């Protein structure tokens, strides 16, 4: 036996979009490659926001 707790082992986060939109899935494929094969942290932020739900992607007004 090992004295550990397993209630936080599984991190809860979006690993992929819950959407079935194939156009969103295609540019997720694009930015999954960009995040992996570059050192840019911009690609990593964009990729994780592509996974995000709509309430986590609020609209941005022109103003």
Partner 1 sequence: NFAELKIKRLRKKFAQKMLRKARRKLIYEKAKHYHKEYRQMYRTEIRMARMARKAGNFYVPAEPKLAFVIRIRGINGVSPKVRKVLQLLRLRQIFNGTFVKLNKASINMLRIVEPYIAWGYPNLKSVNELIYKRGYGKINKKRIALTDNALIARSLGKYGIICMEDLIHEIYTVGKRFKEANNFLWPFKLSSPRGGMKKKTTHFVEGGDAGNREDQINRLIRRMN
Partner 2 sequence: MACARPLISVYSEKGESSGKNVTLPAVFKAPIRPDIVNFVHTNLRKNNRQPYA
Partner 3 sequence: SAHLQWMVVRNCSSFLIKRNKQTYSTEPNNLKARNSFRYNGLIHRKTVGVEPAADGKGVVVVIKRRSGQRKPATSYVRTTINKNARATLSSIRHMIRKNKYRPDLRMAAIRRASAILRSQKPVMV
Partner RNA sequence: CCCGUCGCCGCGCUCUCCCCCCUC
Partner RNA sequence: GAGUGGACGGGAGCGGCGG
Partner RNA sequence: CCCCGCGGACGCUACGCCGCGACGAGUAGGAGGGCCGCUGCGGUGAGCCUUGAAGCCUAGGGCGCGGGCCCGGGUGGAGC
Contact residues: partner 3, CB under 8 A = 22-23, 25-26, 29
Backbone conformation region of residue 59, classed left if phi is above 0, alpha if psi is from -120 to 50, else beta: beta
Separation between Cα atoms, residue 59 and residue 23, nearest integer Å: 19
Contacted by 15, from RNA, partner 3, Mg ion, none: CB < 5 to 8 Å by type = none
Q: Would you give the distance in Å from CA 53 to the centre of its chain?
A: 10
Contacted by 62, from partner 2, partner 1, partner 3, none: CB < 5 to 8 Å by type = none
Residues 6-25 that bind partner 2 (CB under 8 A): 19-23
For residue 62, give the DSSP letter.
Answer: -
Under the rule (CB under 7 A), what is the footprint of RNA?
A: 1-2, 4, 6, 9, 16, 20, 25, 29, 33
């Amino acid at each position: 036996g090992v004295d550990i707790r397993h209630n936080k082992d599984r991190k809860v986060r979006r690993k992929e979009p819950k959407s079935q939109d194939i156009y969103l899935r295609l540019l997720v494929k694009l930015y999954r490659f960009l995040a992996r094969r570059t050192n840019s942290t911009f690609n990593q932020v964009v990729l994780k926001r592509l996974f995000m739900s709509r309430t986590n992607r609020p609209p941005l007004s022109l103003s």
